[PDB]
Subunit: 145 residues, 2 copies
């Protein structure tokens, strides 16, 4: 269940998530847009899903992409803040899962974000240990999709 | 226009917003659910818009309402963090405006949250000065609806 996946994030996984988030979550505009542009660059097939944001090649200058990228980073902030209470983490994961289920985003397609996350972490010198920790948090949302 | 409403957030208004947020933002789950149940109790005609959350009378016990309420408080957190830069505050305001425009929520109906906000601030011993500061930030979202 989502709860099982949540309940299995360990003390050192939560430590790696919090420690990397202190750095990548400090600049939400910069790192949020960096995440979205790496998604569109490496996975060009997803661009069509983001038609509401207009022309995503514009990057930072596209006001709708910048607004979306900041709000996504607050969704991750929320996740990081609920780590010690699985019941609260589960009801916010399920709320964001419904936002993607209505856009017909499958668990497999949602997991395409792991590549971008790994790349943004690597730019701040957080290696594979941290990327693996973040893949465990993404898998909690995948359990809901 | 959003940009003029944004220009109304002067140095003193920004200070009052930050100073009261430091208190109500410390308990996102508690105050978030409090805001929503006060909206439904005082403005019963709005409950129909929230049919996805099921029985909102249950409050904190209703997992969908709790998930919704925590996320709403991170939208407010987001607005407070963008007060330094009006261009970033306006693109996140417009993102949340579209979430309500699709739900057929008018500027007048969105304004019904001011009663709830004043009551929650009042229980924390933040009076009308602070309620009026928050009404000015709510007016930026109203301007985009
Ligand atoms: C770390 C992972 C992710 C998080 C936390 C996340 C978060 C968000 C948030 C908060 C929204 C706004 C929801 C709304 O207001 O309706 C959103 C929208 C969306 N997301 Fe994600 N998302 C993630 C990954 C993905 C991935 C990998 C895809 C697709 C392959 C995806 C596709 C979408 C789509 C299509 C929208 C709607 C865009 C629009 O029209 O505004 N998301 N996402
Ligand atoms: C401080 C003011 C408010 C803020 C920051 C706010 C924020 C939000 C956020 C972040 C969402 C989630 C969007 C999504 O994922 O689709 C939401 C949903 C919603 N809001 Fe608000 N909101 C506010 C006031 C109101 C008011 C006063 C009304 C109506 C009288 C309203 C009606 C709705 C509705 C109908 C939904 C959809 C609930 C659902 O089915 O999931 N909001 N709001």
């Amino acid at each position: 269940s989502v709860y099982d996946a949540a309940a299995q994030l360990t003390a050192d996984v939560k430590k790696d998530l919090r420690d990397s988030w202190k750095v990548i979550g400090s600049d939400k505009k910069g790192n949020g847009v960096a995440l979205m542009t790496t998604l569109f660059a490496d996975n060009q097939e997803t661009i069509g899903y983001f038609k509401r944001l207009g022309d995503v090649s514009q990057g930072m200058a596209n006001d709708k992409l910048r607004g979306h990228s900041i709000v996504l980073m607050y969704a991750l902030q929320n996740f990081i803040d609920q780590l010690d209470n699985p019941d609260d983490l589960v009801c916010v994961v399920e709320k964001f899962a419904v936002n993607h289920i209505t856009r017909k985003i499958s668990a497999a397609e949602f997991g395409k974000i792991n590549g971008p996350i790994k790349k943004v972490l690597a730019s701040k010198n957080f290696g594979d240990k941290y990327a693996n920790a973040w893949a465990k948090l993404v898998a909690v949302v995948q359990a809901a999709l």
